[PDB]
Amino acid sequence: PQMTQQLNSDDMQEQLSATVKFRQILSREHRPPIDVVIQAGVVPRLVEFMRENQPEMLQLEAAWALTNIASGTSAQTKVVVDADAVPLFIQLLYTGSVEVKEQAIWALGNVAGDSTDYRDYVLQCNAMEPILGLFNSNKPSLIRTATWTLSNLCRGKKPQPDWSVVSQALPTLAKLIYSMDTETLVDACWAISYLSDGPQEAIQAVIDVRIPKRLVELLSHESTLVQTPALRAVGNIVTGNDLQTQVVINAGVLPALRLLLSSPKENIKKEACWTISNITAGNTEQIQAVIDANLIPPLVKLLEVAEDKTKKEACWAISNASSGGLQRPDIIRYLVSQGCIKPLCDLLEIADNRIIEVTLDALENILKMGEADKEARGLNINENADFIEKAGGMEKIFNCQQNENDKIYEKAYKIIETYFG
């Protein structure tokens, strides 16, 4: 109350000393007295020190303090939001000095990252314009926070943000990924992964502003804090059509993916398998490109010795590629020569029913090519059938006939009767 007194005081030097105090108590590494401060009702008073007529130093501390109040539970954040502090935060980006903008931008970050509605709210307030205007500055600390806040405005796919509004950030974002600053590179990539999570139009917008080429470079960046969101972003782009996928291929994404398949991080290998599977779902030339990049050997090993979540992803990648054998038979002969059959069978006794369905499709494609070759050449046996039997795979396809799922039994039945009569 000695502090609160100096805050509600009319003395100019007292109101600043009191602001400095509330700031520091909320700037503590340990558990900040967030609720004790709100209890004093000093919120709207600090919102009042963010108005044009306040000294540069009183706005700096007032905003700083108000930022660490929004960085708390949704409730502590709503206390600041309803004290009509948002529009005053935005204006401060237009009128405050650098030090002051750094405080207001950060606060807009916590408010936007609290929920899809506070996000839409900050955007309705037209904060995009002044935020993008901030990057005409050279202060790395200011750039970092602005990229993070910008990040939170693109985030959220359930209630998706206004696209005619957030797509405006792309140009800025395309320049940002050429930054040498690690932290900045992290938030720029997150923002881009959010934006890339949309339809074919979004993806194409990310491509038109020329982001793919640098994004691929970032896959081999030193820090895994950069790689994760960059990988996700490159991943979303290949969920697009064949032409869009080709752009990422021409940027050299494949050699980069080969490196990521040996990543000490397990979730990076998983997302790299995922990414490759969407590339093998492409056309003949793209599947052939995956093969040339030497991606199958390390993808086959993962199918046999890795966390079940990764094995699944690897399964899709190889299964998708096998469907390419109809237009180019060497594709399947190649997968087989690399030993995909054993790791494929060994995955038939897994819990997931959709993976089993995808595994069985691969095996059938392999059995089919095996049959065409038998007839084309002068062979007496379907060689891929033997490989499967010797790998104990025929016994498993046999058990699948007693799986409650319909599609599974019906397919496991077609195989047995057609290739193992």
């Binding site: 700037s27 590494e29 900040p32 700083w64 930022t67 660490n68 929004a70 960085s71 405080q103 950060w106 970050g109 916590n110 990252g113 609290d114 993070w148 990040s151 939170n152 985030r155 796919k157 992290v186 938030d187 997150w190 992964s193 959010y194 994760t228 969101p229 996700r232 991943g235 979303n236 290949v238 969920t239 697009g240 995922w274 599977s277 969407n278 093998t280 779902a281 899709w316 299964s319 998708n320 469907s323």
Partner: peptide, 19 residues
């Protein structure tokens, strides 16, 4: 074949404390 969107969602930190 089939291009699959991601099933698991990803994002950075929702909020940050200034020091």
């Amino acid at each position: 074949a089939v291009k699959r969107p991601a099933a698991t969602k990803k994002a950075g930190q929702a909020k940050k404390k200034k020091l």
